[model samples]
Target: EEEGVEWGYEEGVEWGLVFPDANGEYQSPINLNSREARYDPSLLDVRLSPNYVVCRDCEVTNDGHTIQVILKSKSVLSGGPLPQGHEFELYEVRFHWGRENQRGSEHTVNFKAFPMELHLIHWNSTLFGSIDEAVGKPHGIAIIALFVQIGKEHVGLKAVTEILQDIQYKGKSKTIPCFNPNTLLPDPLLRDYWVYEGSLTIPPCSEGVTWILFRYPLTISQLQIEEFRRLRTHVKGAELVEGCDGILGDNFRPTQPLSDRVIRAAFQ
Candidate 1:
């Protein structure tokens, strides 16, 4: 079951009542207007420790909100737009998808939404002790966003999608070993991206994250997306059906207003 407050996309507007931080100015998943972003040459390339090669064992769960993969190994993230001496530890990976082919991503570029979005969630290991401690602090988190586009089948994604059936219901999970998340990332991984200070797209929308959205997108087949749509929001023994408030697709927060924030680009 989900750990904290119970919130769903359908009633996201009311999230501010419970998670006051959600109403903050730096809230995330905003429309990224590339033309408006200020190019910053000081933004270094994002670096990941070699230990990120593969996960000996990881748990994949249908958390009722989205499919989440909890990493068991230690993978550190540094450089990029993060503070010079800070290092972030890869905590988990989650996905946001839609029911249709055109509108699933949380953030849009040039106002164009993609089929899905992958979030590589990390915590500031250099400055904080645990995710709980860092969640509400400034620059305590850094999330790498990779847009998912539909086209050819993605080998790296096949394993995860294949297991969707086993955990079709909420709170269900299975172990997936020998999985390398790097395979799911786009080439020239650190090349071009939009960096900004933003909040978590979900509720308790803590305004502590450094959002880095890679300019390029990853690929997967339409059928693979269908596999994602097969997930149900109901628990192990629920009586809900497809059109009966149980389908788990389109699990993304709408893009929030940019407010007074300035988005910075890693490249010109």
Candidate 2:
């Protein structure tokens, strides 16, 4: 909600609506025009292991922007083009969903959009040792980007949705138990994906993400997705200030240009 004041009613998501390099080189959330992309044999296959176990006490909150959940285990994601000996630490999970079905994901494939997107954000433990120290550096952060479609109910996501009612209002935090982000992933590995150098999708819009958008999208139910709409931008029913359009709907950055950067696939 507070960000609405900062971004304002700009024609689009201009610099004021984001960070320094937002208008500059290597921006993110791009459309993968597969027909025009290159197939690189040098792009190594990802050996990702999200060792996220159950945590009894988990911090889950609605920040008026999105519902963010924290991970406090020794969950490390190694391999897959990550520096030879470098491993990234799992930190938090944030989500982006559209107001409806047709459009939601940050990145679209062949001009097709999904109902939602999940950002499994991690920081390089080998170089910076801490997320704060790693933010602005080159390839400092890695996000396992997954697109979500509407279908059967997602059991893993149900754990998070069950608690949404408790923290429906922005700025509210609730404790949810037995939440493991690993389960949120598809049982089998969906290794096929497009790897690219890009920027953060949100504020600061820092140009430092080693993004992996999976080729196979995961599925969730229509009812499970609609639960996201329950979160309010600010205090329940608080009137929007003049000039401030509104918050709590379609919180995603528009797709950026491919530019000179390469979007490589893990498979041939």
Candidate 3:
């Protein structure tokens, strides 16, 4: 059975009441029902190039709490088979979501949601020299998001949680030797996904991103989930400490306006 969550927006904003009537608005289980434009995904023949690189030696940053793995690249990402000619460079990857289904994923299907979502962020190299410059433009970013669910124990998670004692708060950090992001990915990667234009899930929620959300969710143990929850939150400035924001709990952004964009499924 799926767990239920007491849904509410951060900083005293009751997002539920904002959109009283559904009225064709794209509503996620997480109370972000707002009127926006929807588009047809068929028009977007988005295809990945045959040329791909196996990225190893990715830099891992463990600030004793949040872990960030970065992949440096200079590949160009084109939209559709015709090739949009826009070059995007691969860079950083991160995760965001809530504890339960109702408040977890920023976007939802016709029905069903997950506990978390991982975003692989990339920036356009030709258009903007750096990630910061590319972030504001519509064609600046491309993100691959994978959904996560509670199930069997994940071996990859063990490596991270086992070291929780070392970095659990602000200002605590460590550099580990030889870590691969592929090891953290779930086996038999789900091919079917929803593709659309979206925004950054965090602050300065910039829009104009090519978002690919996987249909299948990765499995992780309930205990592992609890351990992740124990990590500290972001404070002003201090050495890393464990258990911030009353325990490392759900932290995610409310879904943004669809803006008349079509969300295409992989099968479609």
Candidate 4:
């Protein structure tokens, strides 16, 4: 059983009462208009480090909201535009995907949504000790977003992709070991990213979360993408579905408008 999670509720029904419901400005998963983003040399000098923990038996859950993997405890994530700003702790990681080949990622670059996207959520340890305390304050949360495109098989993704079949049903969970969160992100694109202060993409849409979206996307094979679409939603069902365990695809949140916010790029 996943800790602290009830596992039967649908995140959609609670949308109007949740995250996006908290505030309107700075909502996340916005269309990253590449042409409009301001390039800042200073943002490029920040350091990024992910001190992942060794989990012999990590908990992976299909919470009806997203297929999430939890860590025993938080890991260290700091630097590169952060500069020890608020060395956050990695608490959970999950993905957003679509049913079709054309779209899925929450944050789109130049209006092009990738096939999938991974989000690593970390909470600020400085101002707030826990995720609850952090999300209520300004810049109290930090998240790393990686756009995943279909291409060659990503070896690091093998562990995750391999187990998606086992946890295909909502509320179902299993233990997958030796999973280092860092393995999911690497490369020429990992080092290049954009940053801005935004709200959580989910409901309640609370403010003050730090956003870091990578420019370069990771690769996953066509065959592996099938496992995700096979997932079943929560017990409460969805507007898109009639009952529990309905086809759980197209989980990506629509791109929120950027409004007056400025998206800052760390790379040219």
Q: Which candidate is the best by lDDT?
A: 1
lDDT of 4 by residue, 245-268 (tens): 366677776667688998888877
lDDT per prediction? 0.83, 0.77, 0.54, 0.75
Q: Please identify which of the two predictions, 2 or 4, would achieve the higher TM-score against the true structure.
A: 2
Query: What does candidate 3's lDDT look like per residue over 76-175, in tens digits?
Result: 3455422267666667656555655454555655435568666667787767778988875757878767777888887765655566556566345544
TM-score of each: 0.92, 0.90, 0.68, 0.86
Error of 1 at 124 (Å): 0.8
Sort by TM-score, top down from the best: 1, 2, 4, 3
C-alpha lDDT of residue 248 in model 1: 89
True-vs-predicted CA distance for residue 209, candidate 2, Å: 0.7
Query: Which order, best to worst by lDDT?
Result: 1, 2, 4, 3
lDDT score for residue 157 of model 1: 74
